[model samples]
Target: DTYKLILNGKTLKGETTTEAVDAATAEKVFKXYANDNGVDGEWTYDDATKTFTVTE
Candidate 1:
């Protein structure tokens, strides 16, 4: 499956698809991208939806 990052409420880039074999991988990808992009606040993951959400 593909992983995705959400900023505030909208999906980041909306066209980027991150591939993750496990939740841990997705989490790392999400957190890393968020921090690298200077996104701060809360990070939430929904396994069912496979979404990493950052609310600032």
Candidate 2:
């Protein structure tokens, strides 16, 4: 799970990517956006990878 750090295909220091199935803990590859920008809501996940995908 969330074993790596990456933002929009970019890599983060002291982080790595995880398997799509392990997305539950793959928060490292995920981008946490503040709700201040009207981002408060549910997210989308890939059916095959279970990766979280935001759109809006």
Candidate 3:
């Protein structure tokens, strides 16, 4: 099972974020991409805007 991105404490759909699953470990969690191909990006939560941001 996978969890969808949502506004903190609001349960509203937030900005789309990527996810990864480890079949060997049977673990699923949020995806964190950093410094891949010299491009750094992250998914962040913004309370004031009630949305998420992709920083690169």
Candidate 4:
């Protein structure tokens, strides 16, 4: 139940990753996007740190 990002038809955080999507850098940012609990952008999960770095 963690399908997030929800950018211009570009959904990130598949509850999955293996450096998923090369730093999770997508063609879309979190601007004009109104859904992700007030997050910005960037879906880079460090796995170790498990960080959620915003790209905005």
Candidate 5:
């Protein structure tokens, strides 16, 4: 399954980011991004769409 990490409706990326990956993997990636970027929000995952969205 592929996973997408979206922060404030914008897709996030880094040298380690990936659009096609497992949900757990994406969550970790997003968490790392959030921690490094000082981003805080509520993260929700949609399994059907393979996407994660952050809303505050």
Candidate 6:
């Protein structure tokens, strides 16, 4: 399944751009974004939507 990370109704990018990623990789990307960006929030994955939502 392809997954994307979204923040503030916009897709979050890493380095260059944001692309649909695999499940495990999506989890890593979400964590990387949260940690590296100093984001104080939680990420929830919606399997039906194939997206990760950041709630602060």
Each candidate: RMSD to true structure? 3.2, 7.4, 10.2, 9.1, 4.4, 4.9
Cα lDDT over the full model 5: 0.64
**How do all models score by TM-score?**
0.72, 0.32, 0.25, 0.27, 0.63, 0.58
Tens-place lDDT per residue, model 6, 1-56, is: 55667653234433212454467677676767766766646668778767776766
What order do candidates take by TM-score, descending? Answer: 1, 5, 6, 2, 4, 3
List model 4 lDDT by residue over 1-56, tens digit each. Answer: 12233232244422221233533342132233433434455544344543344443
Candidate 2, after superposition: displacement of residue 29 in Å? Answer: 4.0
Candidate that scores best on TM-score: 1
Give the CA lDDT, 0 to 100, for residue 32 in model 4.
30
lDDT of 1: 0.69
- Winner on TM-score between 1 and 3 is 1
* Alpha-carbon deviation at 52 in model 4, angstroms: 1.2
The per-model lDDT (C-alpha) reads 0.69, 0.40, 0.34, 0.35, 0.64, 0.60
Cα lDDT for residue 32, model 6?
Answer: 74
Angstrom error of the Cα, residue 18, model 4: value is 22
In angstroms, the error of model 5 at 54 is 1.5
RMSD of 6: 4.9
Q: Give the clashing pairs for model 4.
A: 41-55
Candidate 3 error regions (>4 Å): 1-40
Q: Estimate candidate 6's alpha-carbon lDDT, on a 0 to 1 scale.
A: 0.60
lDDT of 3 by residue, 1-56 (tens): 22233322222223334432522121122233222223334556544533344345
Q: How close is candidate 6 to the true structure, as a TM-score?
A: 0.58
Query: Model 3 reaches what TM-score against the true structure?
Result: 0.25
Q: Over the stretch 1-56, how does candidate 5's per-residue lDDT look in tens digits?
A: 55666666334433233664567877887777766766667878777877776654
Q: Candidate 4: where is the Cα deviation over 4 Å? A: 1-39
Name every residue pair that clashes in candidate 1.
none
Best candidate (score: lDDT): 1
